[PDB]
Amino acid sequence: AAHVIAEDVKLLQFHVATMVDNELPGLPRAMQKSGRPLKSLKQRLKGKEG
Amino acid sequence: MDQKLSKLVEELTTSGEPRLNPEKMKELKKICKSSEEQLSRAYRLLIAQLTQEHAEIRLSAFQIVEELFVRSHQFRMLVVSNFQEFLELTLGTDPAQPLPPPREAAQRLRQATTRAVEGWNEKFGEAYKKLALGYHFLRHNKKVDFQD
Amino acid sequence: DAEFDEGFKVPGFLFKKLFKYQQTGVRWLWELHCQQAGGILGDEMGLGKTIQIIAFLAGLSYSKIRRFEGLGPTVIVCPTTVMHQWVKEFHTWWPPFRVAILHETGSYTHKKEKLIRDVAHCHGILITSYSYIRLMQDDISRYDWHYVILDEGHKIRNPNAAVTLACKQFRTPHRIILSGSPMQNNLRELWSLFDFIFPGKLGTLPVFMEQFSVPITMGGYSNASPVQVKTAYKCACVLRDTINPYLLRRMK
Amino acid sequence: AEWKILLSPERVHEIFKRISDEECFVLGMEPRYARPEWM
Amino acid sequence: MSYNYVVTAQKPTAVNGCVTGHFTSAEDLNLLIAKNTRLEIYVVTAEGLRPVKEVGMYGKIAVMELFRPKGESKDLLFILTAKYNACILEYKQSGESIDIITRAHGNVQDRIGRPSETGIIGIIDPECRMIGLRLYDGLFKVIPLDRDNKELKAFNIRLEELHVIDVKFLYGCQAPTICFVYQDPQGRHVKTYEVSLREKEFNKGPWKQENVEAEASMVIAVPEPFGGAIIIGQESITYHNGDKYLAIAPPIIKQSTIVCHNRVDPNGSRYLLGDMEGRLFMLLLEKEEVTLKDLRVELLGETSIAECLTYLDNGVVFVGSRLGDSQLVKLNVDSNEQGSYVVAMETFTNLGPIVDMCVVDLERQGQGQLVTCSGAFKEGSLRIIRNGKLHIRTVPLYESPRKICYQEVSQCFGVLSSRIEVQGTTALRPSASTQALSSSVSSSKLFSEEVEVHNLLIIDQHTFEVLHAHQFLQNEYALSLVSCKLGKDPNTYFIVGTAMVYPEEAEPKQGRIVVFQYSDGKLQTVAEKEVKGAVYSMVEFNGKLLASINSTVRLYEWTTEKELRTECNHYNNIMALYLKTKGDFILVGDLMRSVLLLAYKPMEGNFEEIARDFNPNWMSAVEILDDDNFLGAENAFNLFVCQKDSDEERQHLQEVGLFHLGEFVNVFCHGSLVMPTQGSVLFGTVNGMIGLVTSLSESWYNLLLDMQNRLNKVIKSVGKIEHSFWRSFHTERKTEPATGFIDGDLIESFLDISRPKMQEVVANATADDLIKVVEELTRIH
Amino acid sequence: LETQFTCPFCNHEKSCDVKMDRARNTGVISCTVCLEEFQTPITYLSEPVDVYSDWIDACEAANQ
Amino acid sequence: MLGFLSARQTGLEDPLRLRRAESTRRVLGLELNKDRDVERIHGGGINTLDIEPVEGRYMLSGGSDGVIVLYDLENSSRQSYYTCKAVCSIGRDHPDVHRYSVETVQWYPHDTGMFTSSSFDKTLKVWDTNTLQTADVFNFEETVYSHHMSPVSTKHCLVAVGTRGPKVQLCDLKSGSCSHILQGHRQEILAVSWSPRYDYILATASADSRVKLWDVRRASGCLITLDQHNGKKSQAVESANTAHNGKVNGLCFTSDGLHLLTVGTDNRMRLWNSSNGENTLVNYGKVCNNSKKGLKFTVSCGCSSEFVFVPYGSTIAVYTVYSGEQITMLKGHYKTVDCCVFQSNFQELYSGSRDCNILAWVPSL
Amino acid sequence: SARAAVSELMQLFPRGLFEDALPPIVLRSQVYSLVPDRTVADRQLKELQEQGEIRIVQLGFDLDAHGIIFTEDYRTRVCDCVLKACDGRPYAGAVQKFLASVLPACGDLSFQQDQMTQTFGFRDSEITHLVNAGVLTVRDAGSWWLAVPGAGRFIKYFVKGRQAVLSMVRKAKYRELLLSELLGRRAPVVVRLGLTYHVHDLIGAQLVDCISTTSGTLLRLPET
Ligand SMILES: Nc1ncnc2c1ncn2[C@@H]1O[C@H](COP(=O)(O)OP(=O)(O)O)[C@@H](O)[C@H]1O
Ligand SMILES: [Zn+2]
């Protein structure tokens, strides 16, 4: 379906983007156990204690 | 003999007279009675003038059209052909194409065209089924107040 | 010689050996071929189906029916256990056919890809196991095959198995499935089967679940409500109506 | 892509991939270490 | 529901198809002539034709071609039926027994399709490999012969050109090849194709298309020595062979189009051509070493209008005519001192299209006597019928009659007659109107290539000679005619409704009712009445004149001033063409609404639509059988019987009997040719068939229906064609099984079958009672 | 608040839009698919959702 | 016209000649109702009309306001001028009225004892002619733009349904199995039609702007792929590659199922051969459509030359199918026209528009 | 015949305006102007295109814009100008291969990737070479239309000229005007291609009503 493939490419795009940038405006954070999000390659090297 | 017709309708329309000048009105009557393709030429003049953006000009054009309608038979077929667009430009049924200013001229046009449609339905309505359909369509779909 | 509707002739002596039910099955199968749709042989185990398929194929080639004149390069996906049985039966019943094995045992002793190419260019009946299809899916699915007979295809009941997606690549419409039990755990197997033979008939998979899997399955529970039982009965009747033409299921 | 058309990555890659070396050098993408379609 | 019985008073006589060949035996030169449903087998003797068999097809014979497959001793016969019943037949004579066996049979009708303008065309490849049929536009049905079918399986090869004029199978072709002329907006063209049975599709022709004469209307397949084919135009003639392009323009053919052809020589060096006018021509192909050199056209002479002709041998040519009497002629080597090499050898009587007919008890006997407007343009003649077998007389007119009526008081026939003039105007031949004892010209004040002229011919009803011929105005068509006395004065008049015909209007808008009185050998113009339209029909109605203007039926009154005065009008009619009367009831035959039972109310003095049928049938006749049983014959060769039903529902007439007569009923008329059944109405037809329809009783109808079922179960049709299907009511958009009718011919055939067959039929009373009953039924005719 | 509403007749979501002619104190709502058009006065407090809800009552009230 | 009668009586010309010549002459002289008037019952525009196949008497009609009205066309009165009453109605108070505009309504062919109807409420109800009660329903997941039952199948009774989803449903009326879908399109499906000649050949067109002739027995998607330019190369099954440059919202097989007429929102119509989908380059000029939903039109039958009655703005435009001539324009409506039907018995046309009118065009003289 | 009509219309092309860099271009609509039978016009144009005398190119400015160009003008101008301005830069050879292989073979309007990759052995690099030559432009991913280099100038001038002519007809009385009056009138500077050229285009596309009057053919705007 056009809308199903729309959603699945949306999901593949989402996974790549949250792989290099998790904290996006409006979009949900990639989730993980213990109630916390993940940490992307941009958080590894953002600021103090980066 | 086309220049004089255009001239005459030009004075009748552009003057913005509240009432038609009867002498050149009679000249137009006689000269149009001369020929039928010339009657169509006068019809085209009237249609062109009606589109132009001024309520008084449209009032003058509509009054001329009513005169010819009541007076001529072929003119009746010719106008009821495009009765759709004619009603659109005179009644302003499509809100996307309102009536230009002034407001007084627009209201006078509205009243006069309502009455003219009523009279035409009374007179030629059976003779032109499309006129009866248009009357009914105005009366219900657009809900035009014929008692106003 | 037995004469079918349009032009399908099978040799009379070969027709004679067949039983009543088998020749009925041959007629049904050729009708399926006329419509250009797939099908499943639902005959219970041992009622005799390899004979049916061999008879139909031999008659088709013999009939010279009209890309392909008569029989084109087919393929028979079979479990490894019965491959030499297949070769023996083909040789016994119709020895004209060239049957070449695509297996490590095999009879080629060269590059397999050469064997597939040669069979494709020779209108031969290539037999193979599911493993080669899963592995050689690139090479198998390029030769414009004619038939894709699946022996004991119920292996394919897993819709997303690599073998399933591998075998669902052949572009021909003539797909045959041989299994006396073409449903073993639940309706999803049935769905995948009719996905392989006739992709459209049952809807897309989630639609199929919602439309039949729930009203049918859930209505069979011990605690089923009578109204729910009637609902399941209705849907089961409807589904049997739907799938009737494409299963030929005779019991013992 | 509004004038509201959802533009796709493949469209983009094809468009960029045709850009010549000179126009991208003009844009500032140095053509040898940055080619706009590797984005 | 109603009960009726039709029967053949006289079999059809016109010929619509004739082919010569060796069918009875390999050596026999057989001449087969296809009368509409009678296939007459003759043997071409040294003199005349020797009859050998006549048989009854259950189908209007549309196609008839003789062909000899490979290995076949004598030619096989392939015949197609208008209802698309296909049959291949073989002649098997078992000594005295002549057994026309059905080799292969079947039906070839497509479920939906626009039946082609030029009618069914059936052709066979010269090598006898397949049969090509063109039934519907855009498709080309192909029936292989090599694949021996007992069912005549076929298949369709789509044809990118949709308006084909003609098609033929070219000679000298390794693969089957078709040439056809087709019409497109660009003009008329010619193209060729190659049939490929294995592919079931065409291929590129041996040679590409070409632009032809505008009216190229025939294609003639030349045999192998010359190859190619010959196109005959209205004006020019051409020959193509892919590269050879021979063209001629002999002016002699320009006057009339060439309608028919036949090859003379086995090599095809000689061809015959006949026009509508009946002039017979010769086309002669000049060879050169072989190839074609030159085309030549020469007038051999004139004959009856030849719908189809075939050279037999020895200069003997059979002229099959649908319009006039079929002819047998001798082609002389030398002209007959009039430019004519043809001399008539034999004439077979053909009641031509019976455009109108009237019964008279001439000689004041107890026996009826029919006088018919037979014939056509040049073959126009009157036949007179009596029992003596059916006696036939003849009275040539050399011009087409249109209506006839009898004035016993005047002892003459009012016979509308019409002739054609080419130019003011010039008559082509001396006809009855021009040869009259006396004549006059209408001079009316109401109104003020080749053209038609109408005349009213007053004919002695003793000597059959033209007592008078009052010619009508220029461009006036005398449509309907009636002999009667109106109002209260005793003068019986001849009333002629006419119309003003001009090429510029499709529908005549101007016509006049003219009342004449024939007295003292002279036709006096008693009165006139202008009307605003043609008068398609008038009829007396209780001392009044009921006339039929274009779409308005009105009642006219013969005033004491001897003038017509309208009383009332009725307008709910498309075109009120046919009118009949019984008491206060009228039966109006609309052009497509099929009936309108109009009952005249005298206490008011107007009309009332008592009822109407809403099935849109296209009428060709109408007649009232009883007070509440109405007969009507539609144009598609069917009979339907409408009966008053039993609210507004009472207004709906009901079609109770449906029947496919297979002929075009031109006219009904009450009467009987002879001195259990009730009423009697005779009808003529286009093919010269004369028939009789009568009522029955219920128990008799049931019995006869059962007998017909038994006969169908017993009697074996020619092409294995089921009788019920043959008589099934049929229309382009409808098909119903026959009811309420008892086929006369089948029952009357009860006699000519052997006793075991009666006992089989009468397996459930005795056979002798049925023999008596069928004899009684035979009595009425 | 939002401005596009399901057409009450052709049931196509977000297919109706509004034009508030504040000059004439009249707002128009028109279904692009079925071309249905509803006219009604508006005041300086009115909003599209207020206009739309006049239409539904007009539909139901006439549908009585 | 008298010449035709002479030729017919004399047997010169087959009666076929007169019949088809007169039918054409009637179709040419068509014009607005002199002697009919259709009773007014619809509060909204009329979306569809369907004159019955057999006897051509009764005429369903599906309003934009959810009501269905069943008409009678035969002049039961004794006057020359009359009106077409309404026999019954699925009014708004009936317990089974559609909640929204009725988009398609079709008699059951082979028997008037039934009629099918569809609506934008995602339902396809199967009524009874006589008892007038919805003896079934098929509920769908998206709005139903059009449906069509096969006009010739004596064997199968499938009902193609083109909805806003890209899947062509094939419901059956014999035991109801609405599972079947034809995979391949890409967007909404605005029209579907069954061939009149071949039982199983279904031609659907979608807003993604291509028409695709399926065979519903096969398992190989579609057969033919209609392409404006009919170039050499071939393609797989999608809605792509532009039968028209815009939405295709119209289909009609010509009278005997050979060709295939398609109007589309790019203001063009095209006549395609339906054996090989070969655009036959007839053109028809500029025919104005901008309807966002299905567009119904018809072709004449039993006339010497074949016409097509295609809505054109608020006017019906008559073209000759094979030649492209614009024969005339019928100008009698005030809003856009949406469906026209043809009465092959008497060569009459009925037209329904958004202005809540059903006009009758009858031949003059 | 359409062949004549395209010939005369090609004569009207002011080659000097485009410094003979662009081959003369004729719009299909103008072919409809001189040949009223629209269907015959299309059939005969298809006939010519099959024969290989002309090429049809999607000009893109309107979906119904198909430009008609003689094949030899196309080859001459492309070889001359492209190879001259591009002597040395690589795509000259690729364009030579294209003109040698594809254009004589298939006259099709669009080119799809599979055809060039397989039937013609063109690579992605060579396809990009063409695209930069101006000879191809992107229809879709992996799809491209044939094109004339430099067509943008002609397209811009044609668009402005068409709208200007339509405006001039609009501003005449009735929105009407006689054809002779228009042709004799002094052309606006915006109308760079000549008035007869644009008038044929307007008439052919039914943008202007052609009314045959006693004084000649009048132009009237159809009522919108
Ligand atoms: N008419 C027959 N003649 C000879 N052998 C037969 C016949 N029918 C079935 N058989 C044999 O029965 C056995 C089972 O048939 P097979 O198709 O191999 O298994 P299944 O019936 O489970 O598919 C085979 O060995 C087959 O040769
Ligand atoms: Zn809506």
Coordinates of C-alpha atoms in Angstrom, one line a residue, chain E residues 199-346:
Chain E
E199 CA -1.8 -17.7 -35.4
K200 CA -5.6 -17.0 -35.8
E201 CA -4.7 -13.6 -37.1
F202 CA -4.0 -11.6 -40.2
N203 CA -0.6 -10.7 -41.6
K204 CA 0.5 -8.1 -44.1
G205 CA -1.1 -8.5 -47.5
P206 CA 0.8 -9.5 -50.6
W207 CA 0.6 -5.9 -51.7
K208 CA -0.2 -2.6 -49.9
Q209 CA -3.4 -0.5 -50.0
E210 CA -4.5 1.8 -52.7
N211 CA -7.1 4.6 -53.3
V212 CA -10.1 3.6 -55.4
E213 CA -13.2 5.0 -57.1
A214 CA -15.6 6.6 -54.7
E215 CA -18.3 4.0 -55.4
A216 CA -16.1 1.0 -55.7
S217 CA -18.8 -1.5 -54.8
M218 CA -17.7 -4.9 -56.1
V219 CA -14.6 -7.1 -56.0
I220 CA -14.0 -9.9 -58.6
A221 CA -11.4 -12.5 -57.8
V222 CA -9.7 -13.4 -61.1
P223 CA -8.4 -17.0 -61.4
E224 CA -4.7 -17.9 -61.3
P225 CA -3.5 -17.2 -64.9
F226 CA -4.0 -13.4 -64.3
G227 CA -4.1 -13.3 -60.5
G228 CA -5.0 -10.2 -58.5
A229 CA -8.6 -9.0 -58.6
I230 CA -10.9 -6.6 -60.4
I231 CA -12.7 -3.7 -58.8
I232 CA -15.9 -2.5 -60.4
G233 CA -16.9 1.0 -59.7
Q234 CA -20.2 2.8 -60.4
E235 CA -18.3 4.6 -63.2
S236 CA -14.9 3.0 -63.9
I237 CA -13.4 -0.4 -63.8
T238 CA -9.9 -1.3 -62.7
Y239 CA -7.6 -4.3 -62.3
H240 CA -4.9 -4.6 -59.7
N241 CA -2.2 -7.3 -59.3
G242 CA 0.2 -5.6 -56.8
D243 CA 2.0 -3.9 -59.7
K244 CA -0.3 -4.1 -62.7
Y245 CA -2.8 -1.2 -62.6
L246 CA -5.2 -1.4 -65.6
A247 CA -7.9 1.2 -65.6
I248 CA -10.8 1.9 -68.1
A249 CA -13.8 4.3 -68.1
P250 CA -16.4 3.0 -70.6
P251 CA -19.3 5.4 -70.4
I252 CA -21.8 2.6 -71.2
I253 CA -21.9 1.6 -67.6
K254 CA -22.5 5.0 -66.1
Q255 CA -26.3 5.0 -66.4
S256 CA -26.9 2.2 -63.9
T257 CA -24.6 0.6 -61.3
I258 CA -23.3 -3.0 -61.9
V259 CA -24.8 -5.1 -59.2
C260 CA -24.0 -8.7 -60.1
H261 CA -21.3 -10.7 -61.8
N262 CA -20.4 -14.2 -62.8
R263 CA -17.3 -15.8 -64.3
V264 CA -17.8 -17.5 -67.7
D265 CA -14.5 -19.3 -68.4
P266 CA -12.8 -21.8 -66.0
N267 CA -9.6 -19.8 -66.6
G268 CA -11.6 -16.6 -66.1
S269 CA -11.0 -14.9 -69.4
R270 CA -14.7 -13.9 -69.6
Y271 CA -17.1 -12.3 -67.2
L272 CA -20.7 -11.2 -67.2
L273 CA -22.2 -8.1 -65.5
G274 CA -25.7 -7.0 -64.9
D275 CA -27.0 -3.7 -63.6
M276 CA -30.1 -2.7 -61.8
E277 CA -31.6 -1.6 -65.1
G278 CA -31.4 -5.1 -66.4
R279 CA -28.9 -4.4 -69.2
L280 CA -26.7 -7.4 -69.3
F281 CA -23.0 -6.7 -70.1
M282 CA -19.9 -8.7 -70.9
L283 CA -16.4 -8.1 -69.5
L284 CA -13.5 -9.8 -71.4
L285 CA -10.0 -10.1 -70.0
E286 CA -7.3 -9.9 -72.7
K287 CA -4.2 -11.9 -71.8
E288 CA -0.6 -11.3 -72.9
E289 CA 2.4 -13.6 -72.7
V290 CA 0.7 -14.9 -69.2
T291 CA -0.5 -11.5 -67.8
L292 CA -3.4 -9.2 -68.3
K293 CA -3.4 -6.8 -71.3
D294 CA -6.6 -4.8 -71.6
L295 CA -10.2 -4.5 -70.2
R296 CA -13.2 -4.4 -72.5
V297 CA -16.9 -3.9 -71.9
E298 CA -19.7 -4.6 -74.3
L299 CA -23.5 -4.6 -74.1
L300 CA -24.9 -8.1 -74.8
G301 CA -28.5 -6.9 -74.3
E302 CA -31.2 -6.5 -71.7
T303 CA -33.1 -9.0 -69.4
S304 CA -35.2 -9.0 -66.3
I305 CA -33.5 -7.1 -63.4
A306 CA -30.9 -9.7 -62.5
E307 CA -30.3 -10.0 -58.7
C308 CA -28.1 -13.0 -59.4
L309 CA -27.1 -14.8 -62.6
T310 CA -24.9 -17.8 -63.5
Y311 CA -23.7 -19.0 -66.9
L312 CA -24.7 -22.6 -67.3
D313 CA -23.1 -23.7 -70.6
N314 CA -23.4 -23.4 -74.4
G315 CA -24.4 -19.7 -74.2
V316 CA -27.2 -20.7 -71.7
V317 CA -27.4 -18.2 -68.9
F318 CA -29.8 -18.4 -65.9
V319 CA -31.0 -15.0 -64.8
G320 CA -32.3 -15.2 -61.2
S321 CA -34.4 -12.1 -60.5
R322 CA -35.7 -11.0 -57.2
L323 CA -37.8 -8.2 -58.8
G324 CA -39.3 -10.0 -61.8
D325 CA -39.8 -13.4 -63.4
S326 CA -36.6 -15.5 -63.3
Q327 CA -35.3 -16.1 -66.8
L328 CA -33.4 -18.7 -68.8
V329 CA -31.7 -17.1 -71.8
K330 CA -29.3 -18.0 -74.7
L331 CA -26.3 -15.8 -75.4
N332 CA -26.0 -15.6 -79.2
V333 CA -22.7 -15.1 -80.9
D334 CA -24.5 -12.7 -83.3
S335 CA -26.7 -9.8 -82.2
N336 CA -30.4 -10.1 -82.6
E337 CA -30.4 -7.1 -85.1
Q338 CA -31.2 -4.8 -82.1
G339 CA -27.7 -4.8 -80.6
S340 CA -28.9 -7.7 -78.4
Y341 CA -27.2 -11.1 -78.3
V342 CA -29.5 -12.4 -75.5
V343 CA -32.7 -14.2 -76.4
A344 CA -35.1 -15.4 -73.7
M345 CA -35.3 -19.2 -73.5
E346 CA -37.5 -19.8 -70.5

